[PDB]
């Protein structure tokens, strides 16, 4: 979830992820989980508010442990009437050293134990006053879970209202730049090779430093390369920056720069500072 601060602008967070239908994720750093938020800027410039989030979660070890407890040794209420209600904390102290295999639990298997000890556990259960009506079930469940594999079905059926979700939070202050600009250029390509049908990118990014500059990269061309030299005319509106290119060439490296952070600056005109450099080669 995501929460908006007490300043209360017209921030419209349309992004709000609810994992209602899946109770599933994995974060083993092989694939990439990306969450994203489609927020809105304020009614005016607003650069420093505070955002706090709400991630409910669990960990998969007690997810499979809740599954193994609720459907491996305490499935019915008949065994839950006597055989485990007097040894529940002993069952938790036995379950905390299970150490199930979480390396093949993300590849076509779930609730599959590793090569942990199962020899002296019977002697440890026999050392106390554990009756055979529970010592048969607590041995047969570990013997079954020593080699078994489940699926993604009937996982939420055990996970439903049987996990304390640690609703953690963080802090994201929505960082901002320093030097606002607003420019728009226009090009006219004197063709070396006739046209290479280039793909465009009208950038919007601002430089935030002192005694600095704004460096731009040209559009991307994908036919026969090394050619299509583009001429340009600036019309550098709403400022007085310094330009450092004239009639470049759209091959391997042109880098039509514009020295910006020297004179005639402004304040933070938006959420961050902006430079919405929209080229238009028509």
């Amino acid at each position: 979830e995501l929460s908006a601060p007490d300043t209360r602008n017209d921030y419209n967070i349309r992004g709000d992820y609810i994992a209602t239908t899946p109770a599933l994720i994995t974060f083993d750093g092989n694939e990439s989980f990306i969450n994203c938020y489609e927020i809105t800027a304020n009614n005016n410039f607003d650069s420093k508010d505070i955002f706090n989030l709400k991630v409910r979660y669990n960990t998969l070890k007690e997810q499979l442990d809740c599954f193994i407890t609720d459907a491996v040794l305490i499935e019915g209420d008949v065994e839950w009437f006597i055989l485990f209600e007097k040894w529940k904390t002993f069952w938790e102290l036995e379950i905390l050293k299970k150490l199930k295999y979480d390396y093949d639990a993300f590849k076509e298997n779930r609730i599959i134990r590793l090569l942990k000890t199962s020899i002296d556990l019977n002697k440890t259960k026999s050392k106390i006053r554990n009756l055979c009506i529970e010592k048969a079930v607590l041995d047969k469940i570990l013997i079954c879970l020593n080699k078994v594999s489940r699926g993604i079905a009937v996982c939420n059926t055990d996970m439903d209202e049987y996990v304390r979700n640690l609703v953690p939070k963080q802090l994201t202050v929505p960082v901002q730049l320093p030097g606002f600009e607003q420019f728009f250029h226009v090009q006219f390509e004197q063709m070396e090779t006739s046209h290479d049908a280039l793909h465009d990118t009208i950038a919007t990014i601002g430089n935030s430093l002192s005694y600095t500059v704004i460096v731009e990269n040209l559009s991307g061309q994908w036919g026969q390369d090394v050619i299509d030299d583009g001429g340009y005319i600036f019309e550098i509106l709403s400022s007085n920056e310094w330009l450092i290119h004239g009639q470049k060439r759209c091959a391997i490296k042109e880098k039509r720069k514009e020295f910006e952070v020297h004179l005639i600056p402004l304040k933070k005109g938006y959420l961050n500072f902006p430079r919405v450099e929209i080229t238009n080669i028509n």
């Binding site: 006739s194 994908w222 026969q224 090394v226 050619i227 030299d229 310094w242 450092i244 004239g246 020295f259």
Partner: protein, 251 residues
């Protein structure tokens, strides 16, 4: 020592080497004149470039630019002008000369006068399909770039062979997927997919008999630069000549 100049030369495939000169006001000269100008309270300079030209050879000919150029004047800037030289098949390296005229106008209409002239050699710092065995060459006589819709069209091969046995070769397109990092795996799959069913040859398994007209029809839209499906097999001493030539957009 007021505007550092460099020239970059590139080799276009259309038999015209393009050389572009770039001029930029050097930063050491900028601070050098800038502190003495800001002593008299000046922030932006005025170097008026009023006559910039490039000359060719021992007889001086003025090769023009690729576009227009006025008489401009600015400070703390850089500008590049590109001329089109002629591609040389021999080892004669052309030596050209360039010249400029920077009018370093100090204020209240009290201007200095500077001129500069460099001269150096325009070096470049270092298709027809030919086989590996014999004299057999391939080239498409029709222009390899062509603009078609998804309709029927034609294309024209040409063979220059040893005149001893000009025949005994066959063409075919091989409309099947080549049998292949999941992202690079699926990118190579998309390349091998759109190769194998993008255009289809309307006469494959085709015995050749110095022209050879072969006719396609194009199905799927996109630019097929070096369309490499079609594969001319040589019958005797069984090997394969790839034809990595031709590029048809289908829009």
């Amino acid at each position: 020592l007021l505007n550092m100049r460099l020239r970059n030369i590139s080799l276009k495939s259309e038999h015209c080497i393009l050389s572009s000169l770039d001029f930029q006001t050097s930063k050491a000269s900028e601070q050098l004149t800038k502190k003495f100008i800001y002593p008299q309270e000046h922030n932006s300079f005025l170097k008026l470039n009023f006559q910039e030209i490039s000359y060719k050879l021992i007889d001086g000919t003025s090769q023009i630019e690729l576009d227009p150029i006025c008489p401009l004047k600015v400070p703390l800037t850089a500008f590049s002008y590109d001329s089109i030289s002629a591609t040389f098949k021999l080892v004669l390296l052309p030596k050209s000369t360039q010249p400029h005229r920077v009018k370093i106008t100090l204020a209240y209409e009290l201007e200095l006068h500077p001129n500069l002239k460099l001269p150096v050699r325009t070096s470049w710092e270092t298709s027809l399909v030919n086989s590996k065995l014999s004299n057999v060459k391939f080239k498409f006589i029709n222009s390899n770039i062509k603009v078609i819709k998804g309709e029927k069209f034609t294309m024209r091969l040409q063979i220059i062979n040893s005149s001893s046995s000009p025949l005994d070769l066959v063409v075919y397109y091989n409309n099947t997927i080549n049998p292949i990092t999941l992202e690079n795996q699926y990118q190579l799959h998309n390349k091998y997919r759109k190769i194998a069913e993008g255009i289809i040859l309307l006469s494959n398994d085709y015995k050749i008999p110095y022209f050879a007209d072969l006719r396609f029809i194009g199905i799927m839209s996109g630019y097929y630069g070096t369309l490499s499906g079609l594969k001319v097999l040589d019958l005797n001493t069984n090997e394969l000549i790839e034809v990595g030539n031709g590029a048809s957009v289908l829009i």
